[PDB]
Symmetry: D2
C-alpha cells in the first residue's frame, strides 16, 4: 500500500548498493581466505605477481557497464566519448612505455587475455590451415604457439592452423637456430613465433628475423613473460626485429589480466636496383580480426587497469624493481647451484630458472606437491624432454612475485634453503614407502599419515613465519 | 646514509598501495566523467545494465593475482585450494539459479565472455569446416551465430566453420521455422543455434529441437539477452529442449562481463534395440575446448563476480525486478505505438523492441545520432525489408538498464515522449537540407553548426534533469 | 650370350609384333564374346553408344607411346612437334563443332574423362571448401556435381568442397528454379552447375545465369549427355549463358572416352563509366589445374580419337543421325505412354526418358534385372520423391545407341513392346510371391529356380533375333 | 521419313565403318609422321617405351563402348558379364606378376593413369589437410608427391593436403634417411612416399618402413619408373615393406597408359593379451576413393591392354629384356664417365642416369635443345646442389625405349659418343656468346647460323641412319 510493492522495491534498491561483505558473506569469506594465503606464503610461480592497488581500484569501476564494440574510429554505439578518451590514452601509454615511434607502430588494447591476442594474430595474418612455427611446448614454447603430438592436437592453434615446432639442443638447453633455419626451408612457415614460457635465456631476434625473411614469413614475438623486463629496459627488446609483438599485461608487467597486440606500419621494405616500395597492412588485418572477427565488446574496465599499470611501468621505481627482480634471480640460481642442483643452461638471463631434479631420482611432479604442502607455490614445468605434463622432471621458479613484496638477495637465499629442505623431504618420503606407486598414492602419506606431516608442519611454519614478515600489495587486505 | 638506493624503494613501496585517485589522476578523472554520464542520461541500449556494488567490489579483489589454469581437481599450479572453493561454488550456484538437476547438467564458468563461450562450443562439437545454422544477422541473430556475405566471411565463426543462416518472414517479423526445417535437410547442419540479439519474441525451442534431431544435429541456445529473464522465471526456459546453452553474465543478468557454457550429461538414446545405453560426452569435449584448447588461465576475479550475481539472481527482489523489466517494456511499446510508430511483430515478449522508422522517411542511422546528442543512448539496428548495416531503418530499445534504476511505467511513458521529441527533431533537421546529403553531412549540421543545437540543448536538459532524479547502482564514492 | 642372343631375343622380338589373336587368346576370346553381346542385344542405356571405326582405329596408334606433359605453348619434353599438331587440330575442331568464336572461347582437351574434367574446374575456380550448387543426385544430377549425406560426404566433390543441392518439383518433375534462386542467396555458391544425367527436359540456362550473377558465381554446364545433340544443333546450346562448359566425348558425341573443358575469355565486364575492363582469367586457372595441377601426361591417342569424332560431328550425316535420335525417343515415349506407363514430366525434349514403375507395384531394381536376362540394357534410376533409393521406382532409357545401328520409329515401337513384355513378366514372377520378399528373394526365385526361365528364354530369343538384324559400328570384328 | 533425307543414311552408314585412312586423312598423316619420328631417332627419355602390338591391338577394341561404373560383384549397370571377366583376369595377372599372395594383397586396376592412382590413395588414407612426406621434386621426387613454393601450392597434392619433403645429401646424391627420420618426428606425417622419377639408386624400404611405423604412418611406394624391373625380378621389390604400392603401366612395364593401386589386406594387428585381429581396411577405403569417390566409368579398353602387358611381363623373354635394359644402362654410364662426364651418385642401380653438365659451363636446358635438333630425345633435370633450378645442370637418360628396339652394349656406346658430340656442339655454339647467357638467346643463335645448322644437320643424319637400322615395335607402319 506504501505505493505498491513498497517492501521489495526497497530491498532491490539496497541490494544494488549493499557491500559485498553483507550481500554475499560466502564469497566474501573465500576472497579473504585467499588474500591471506597469498600473504603467508612464498609465491615462486614465474607467471604470477601482485597488482598495485591503483590498478585493482580501476577494475571495479563503472566502466564495467559500457558497451563500445567498435574502435575509437567508428563505434557501433554512442556515449563512447569517455571510453574513447580511455582507449586512446592506453594506446598512447602503450607505445610510450616501449619507446615506440607511433609512425612505425600501433597497438590494439582489446584482447581479453594472452591466448586471445595470439589467436587473433594467427587469424589475421596466417588464415585457416596456414603454417606456423613455434618452440615445442616441452622445450619452452607455449600452448598457443602451435602445440600437437604424434596422436592428439591439444591447442586451438594446431587445430585451425598447421603447426610444426623447432627445438633446443637437449645437450645445452639453447634454442637450435640452425635446425629451425633448416626446417623452415622445407615447411615454408607463414609466421614464426619467438616467445617462451620456460626459457631462461634471451632470444636471437636478429637471427630469427633473418630466417623469417629468408622464407618470407612474419616474425611474431610473444613477450608475455618479459613484458615488464623489456619495458624497464633491463633486457633486449624484441621490437627491433619483429613485425608483431603480442603480450599479456599481468606477470612481469604487474597489471590486470589482458593482452595487447603491437604491430608495425608504413615503412615496410626497400628495393635495391628494383627501387620499388612495399607497405605494412598489419594494422588493418589485425584490428579487424579482433573485431568483429573474434571478440564482442571490449572490457573497458580492464583497459583502464592496463593504462594505470602502463604509467607505473614508466617510472624509475619500476625500472629499479625490475632490476632487483633480475638480481634476485641470480641470487636464487647461485644459492641453488651451490647447494648442488642442476639449473638448465647453467643459469638465467631473465626472471626465471628451471631445475633438473632428474639428477636426484625425484621428478618435478612429486617435489611440486611437497613444496605446496609447505606454503611454497610453483610449477612442475616440463623439462627439455619427451616425458609429459602432470609428471615432469623439473621445477620452474620465478622472482617477480616475491621481489614485488620486498625480498632481496639475502632473503632469496633463505628461500633457496627452504626449497632445499623441501626436496630433501621429498627424497626421504620417497623411500619411506619405496615402491612403484604414482602421484595419486603420494598424496597419501602426504595428505593423511601424520608422522610425515609433522615434518611438513614444521617447515610450513618456519616458511609462513618468514613470509608473513613482508608487505603484500593490493587493497586494505582483501 | 644508505639513501642513494633505499630512498627509491620507499616510493616503489607506496606506488603499490597508493590509491588510484593519486596514482593516476588522468584515469581517475575519466572514470568519474563516465560515472557521471551514466547518471544523467537515459540508457536504452538493450544489452547494457548496471552491476550491483557487491559484484564490482569482487572484481578488484586479490583473486586477480592467482593462476589456476586447469579445473578444480587437477590444476597445473598449486595453492588453488581457495580458487577451487570459489570455482565450485559458482558452478553450484549456476545450476541452482536455473533449476538444473546436476545429474543431467554441468557448467563451465571459465569463458572470458560471450563470443568466447560460443566459439568454444563450435570448436568442441562442430570441428573445422563443420556446418552451423544460425539466425541471419540482419534478422535478429548475433554476429557469432555465423555472418558472411557474397565475398567476405566476417564472424570468425563463418571463417573456421561453414555457416548458413535461416530467416524471419519479412511480412510478420517471426522466425520462418518452416524454411529452416526445409534447408536443414539440404545443408545437414551439425549444430543449430537458437538465440538472438534483436528478436522481441520467444523461440520455439520445441520445434527447433525437432528439426535438430531430424538431421541429427545439436541444438544450442545462446540466451545472452534473456539470461536474467530466464533465471527469474518470467520467460520460457531453453533448458527444456536444448543440448547446450551458452550465455553472457552481464545484460539481463546484471553481473560482470563473462560467459558460461551449460551442457547436458547423462544418457541419451534409449536404444530400443537391445539393453544398450548411449551417453552424452559434451562435458568432456567442451571442457577440453575451453582449456587447454582455447583459453589460458581463468580470470578468477570475474568468476567471483559472477558467483555474487548468481546469488542475487535467485532472490525475490530479483524476480520482481525482472517482472518490472518486462512490464516496463510493454508500457514503452504501447506509448510508442500509440504515438504512431511501427513496432516489429507488433510488440514484445521480452525486454526489447525494434522500431521501423522507415514509415517516416528517416533511417535508424540519423535518428540514433540525434538521440545521443540528447543524452539518450540508443543503438540502430538492421531489420526486415532491406539491410544497410550501420545505416539500418530501425532502433533497438531495451529496459533492463533503466528499470534497475527505479523507472516504472509512468516514467517509461515520459521516456517514450522524449524519444518522440527526438525523432521529431531528426525529421525537422533532415528536411532542411540537400536531398543528396550524406550521414557525415547530417552529423555536421547537427554539430554546433546551428540554432538547431539550441533545440537539442533544450531537450538534452529536460532529459538530463529527468534522469538525474533516479538512483544509480554501483560504488558510493571511490 | 648363348640361348639368349639366339632364342630369347628372337622370341622377345616376335612377342612385340605378334597379333593379339596369338599373343593372348584368353583376352582375345573375351573381346569377341563382348563384341558379340553388343550385336545381339538391345542397348537402351542412355549413356552408351558405338564408336565409329575411324575413331577406334586411332586409339591403338603409336601416339600411345609419346609423353608431352605440358601444352602446345611450352612443354616439358621434346619431339612434340607432331603431338602439337594433333593437340591444336583437336582444339581447333572443338571450337568449330560448337560454333564458338576463338576470340571468346578456349578449350582443354586433356581431361582423361568426364569426372576428371569437372574436378579440374572446381579445383581451378572453387578452391578447397569453396561452395558449389548442383542438382541433387536422385533429382537428376551426377555424383561429380557433389553428393553427400547427414552421415558421410560420399563423392570427391562434396569431400574437398562444400556442396548443397537444389531440387525438382516432385509434383511435375521440373527443376525448381525458384527454390534455387532462394537458397543461393543464403548459401552463397561460388559456382552453380547446370547439367544432368537423368533429366528429359532442357535447362533454363538463361534463368540459371541470372541467379549465378545475382550471387556473383560462375555458371558451369556439364553437357555430357547432350554434347552430341548440341553440336548437331537439335537442342539449345548452353554456350549462350554459361562461363564454363565441361563434357565427355563419348555418349551422344560417339567418340572415345575422354573429357573437355570449354571456357570463356577476353572482357568479362566493363565498369559503368570507368574504362577499367574486368577480364576472364579462366583459361589461366583451368589450364593450370589440369597440369601441373591434377594430371600427368596427356593421353595423346585418346585426343586423336576425339579429333576424329569431332570432325564426324560436323557432318550432315551426323546432324541427321542426331535428328533421328530425338525422333526415336518420342516414338518410344509415346508407344510406352500408350501402353499405359508413366513417363516423368510427360515426355522428353532430348534422347532419354524416365519410367515411373511405381504405379505397378514393381520397382526399377527388379525390372532392370529381368530385362537384362532378356538381352535388354537399362538403368534403374530413381524418381522424383522416391521415399528413398534401394527401391528406385524407375528405369532410364536412351536412344543414341540403337539409333546408331539403324533403328527407326517402327523399330523402337517393336522395342517398346519387348519392354512391355519384360515388365509384364516381372509382375508375374512378382505377383505370386508378392510379399515383403527382398529384391534378392526375387533375384533368386526369378532366374533362380522356377523353371520358367523358359519364359525369359523365349523372349530373349525373339529379342536377339530382332537385334542381330541390324548393323553394329566398330572395328572388323573386335 | 520419305526419300527426302534417307539418302545420307547411306553415308552416315559408311562413315562409321570407313577406315581412318579415308575418314580423316589429316589425322592419319600426323600419326604416320609421328610413327616415323620414333623410328629414325634415339629415344633416351627415361619414362618412355614402345608398346607391343598385342597391347595396342586391344586399345581400339569394342570395350571402349561399355559402361561398368561399379566393381565386379557390385556394378550399377548390366551386361558387365564380360567386362567382369576381363577386370578379374587383369586383377589376377597383376598379383601374379608381382608374386603376391592374394590373401595379403589386392589391386585396383581402374586408375586412369599414374597421378590419378596416387591422388586416389591420398584421398582414401590421408584425407583433406592430412600430412604427407615425399622426396622433394628437384632431388628426384615426382610432381604428385607434393610440390609447393612459399608463395603458392602447385601440385594438387600440396593443395588439398599438407606436404613437406625430405632430401638427398647434395654431396653424394643419396637420400638422407637420417634427416627424414628426424623431421618425421616433428611433422607427424600420416603417409610417407617412397618413389622417384629421377634417382638412380635403390630405396631403403626397410628403413623407410621403420620410420613410418615409428610415427605410425603408412608407407606408400610409387614404383612407376621400376614397375617392369621389379616384375622381372632384376631389382629389389617394394612389396616387402610397403603398405601400399601404386604404379603406371607404361614406362618400364611396356603397357598402355594407366595406373594400379596395390594394397595390403587381412589381419596385421593382434597385440594386448587378447588376440586383437584388427585387420587392414585399405581395400575398403581405397576402392571407394577410386569409385564413387573420384572416377567415373572405368576405361575397359585400357584395362584390356594392361592385362595383355601383364601376361607379357611374366615371360622369360621379358625377364631377359629387363636384364639387357639394366646392362645397357651400365654400358652408357661407363662410356659416358669414361668420356669425362659427371654421373650423380657415380652410376646407376636401375634403368636411368643423371648427368651433371655443370662441370662444363653448360646447363641441361641448352644441351637438351641441341640434342633434340639431332634426333636425340633427352631431358634436362636439376641435380642435387644447384640453386639454379631455372639453370638445370643435368640430363636424364633412360634405356628401356632403345633396349626394346634391340640395342646392346656396343650400340649404347656408339650412342654415348653421339651424345658427347652433341654437348660438344653445345659448348661450341655457347663458347662464343656474350656471358650473361639467356637461353632465350642460345636457342636463338642455335637456329640461324649456317655453320651451326650444317653441323647439326650432319650429326642428325649420322644419328638417323644409325637409328633407322633397328626394329620398332607396334602395329605395322602405324
Ligand atoms: N541484430 C543485432 N545483431 C547483432 O549481432 C548486433 C546488433 N543487433 N546490435 C549491435 C551489435 C553490433 N552490430 C554489428 C553489425 C554488423 C557488423 C559488420 O558486419 N560490419 C561490417 C561492415 C561492412 C558491411 O556491412 O559489409 C564489417 O565488414 O566489419 C559488426 C557489428 N550487435 C551485437 O554484436
Ligand atoms: C610418370 N611420370 C614420369 C615423367 O617424367 O614423365 C610417374 C607417375 C604418373 O604419370 P602419369 O603421366 O601417367 O600420370 C607417377 N609417379 C611417378 C614417381 C612417376 O615417374
Ligand atoms: C557421364 N556419366 C553418365 C552415366 O550414365 O553414368 C557424366 C560425367 C562423366 O563420367 P565419366 O565416367 O567419364 O567420368 C560427368 N557429368 C555428367 C552430368 C555425366 O552424365
Ligand atoms: C546472443 C548473444 N550471444 C553472444 C554475445 C557476445 O557478446 P560479448 O562478446 O560482449 O560478451 C551477445 C552480445 N550482444 C550484445 C548486443 O546485442 O548489443 C549476444 O547478444
Ligand atoms: C609466451 C606466452 N604467451 C601468451 C600466454 C597467454 O596466457 P593467458 O591466456 O593466460 O593470458 C602465456 C601464458 N603463460 C602462462 C604460464 O606459463 O604460466 C605465455 O607464457
Amino acid at each position: 500500500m506504501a505505493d505498491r510493492d513498497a517492501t521489495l522495491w526497497a530491498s532491490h534498491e539496497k541490494m544494488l548498493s549493499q557491500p559485498l561483505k553483507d550481500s554475499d558473506a560466502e564469497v566474501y569469506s573465500i576472497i579473504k581466505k585467499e588474500s591471506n594465503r597469498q600473504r603467508v606464503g612464498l609465491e615462486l610461480i614465474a607467471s604470477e605477481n601482485f597488482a598495485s592497488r591503483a590498478v585493482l581500484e580501476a577494475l571495479g569501476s563503472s566502466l564495467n557497464n559500457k558497451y563500445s564494440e567498435g574502435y575509437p574510429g567508428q563505434r557501433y554505439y554512442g556515449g563512447t566519448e569517455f571510453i574513447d578518451e580511455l582507449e586512446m590514452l592506453c594506446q598512447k601509454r602503450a607505445l610510450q612505455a616501449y619507446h615506440l615511434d607511433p609512425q612505425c607502430w600501433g597497438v590494439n588494447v582489446q584482447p581479453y587475455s594472452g591466448s586471445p591476442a595470439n589467436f587473433a594474430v594467427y587469424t589475421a595474418l596466417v588464415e585457416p590451415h596456414g603454417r606456423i612455427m613455434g618452440l615445442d611446448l616441452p622445450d619452452g614454447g607455449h600452448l598457443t604457439h602451435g602445440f600437437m603430438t604424434d596422436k592428439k592436437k591439444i591447442s586451438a592453434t594446431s587445430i585451425f592452423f598447421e603447426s610444426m615446432p623447432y627445438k633446443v639442443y637437449p645437450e645445452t638447453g639453447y634454442i637450435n637456430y640452425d635446425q629451425l633455419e633448416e626446417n623452415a626451408s622445407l615447411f615454408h612457415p607463414k609466421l614464426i613465433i619467438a616467445g617462451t614460457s620456460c626459457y631462461s635465456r634471451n632470444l636471437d631476434y636478429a637471427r630469427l628475423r633473418k630466417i623469417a625473411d629468408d622464407n618470407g614469413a612474419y616474425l611474431m614475438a610473444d613477450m608475455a613473460h618479459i613484458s615488464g623486463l623489456v619495458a624497464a629496459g633491463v633486457v633486449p627488446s624484441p621490437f627491433e626485429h619483429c613485425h608483431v609483438v603480442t603480450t599479456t599485461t599481468h606477470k612481469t608487467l604487474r597489471g590486470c589480466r589482458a593482452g595487447m597486440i603491437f604491430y608495425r606500419k608504413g615503412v615496410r621494405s626497400v628495393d635495391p636496383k628494383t627501387g620499388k616500395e612495399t607497405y605494412y597492412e598489419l594494422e588493418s588485418l589485425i584490428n579487424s580480426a579482433v573485431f568483429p572477427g573474434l571478440q564482442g565488446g571490449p572490457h573497458n574496465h580492464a583497459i583502464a587497469g592496463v593504462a594505470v599499470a602502463l604509467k607505473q611501468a614508466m617510472t624509475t621505481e619500476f625500472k629499479i624493481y625490475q632490476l632487483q627482480v633480475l638480481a634476485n634471480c641470480r641470487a636464487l640460481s647461485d644459492a641453488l647451484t651451490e647447494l648442488g642442483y642442476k639449473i638448465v643452461t647453467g643459469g638465467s638471463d631473465n626472471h626465471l630458472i628451471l631445475m633438473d631434479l632428474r639428477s636426484k631420482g625425484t621428478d618435478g611432479g612429486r617435489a611440486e606437491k611437497v613444496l605446496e604442502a609447505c606454503s611454497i607455490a610453483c610449477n612442475k614445468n616440463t623439462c627439455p624432454g619427451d616425458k609429459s605434463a602432470l609428471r615432469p622432471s623439473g621445477l620452474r621458479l620465478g622472482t617477480p612475485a616475491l621481489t614485488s613484496r620486498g625480498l632481496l638477495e639475502e632473503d632469496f637465499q633463505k628461500v633457496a634453503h627452504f626449497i632445499h629442505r623441501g626436496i630433501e623431504l621429498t627424497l626421504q618420503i620417497q623411500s619411506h614407502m619405496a615402491t612403484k606407486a604414482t602421484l595419486k598414492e603420494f598424496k597419501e602419506k602426504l595428505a593423511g599419515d601424520e608422522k610425515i606431516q609433522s615434518a611438513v608442519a614444521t617447515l610450513r611454519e618456519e616458511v609462513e613465519n618468514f613470509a608473513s614478515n613482508f608487505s603484500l600489495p593490493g587493497l586494505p587486505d582483501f
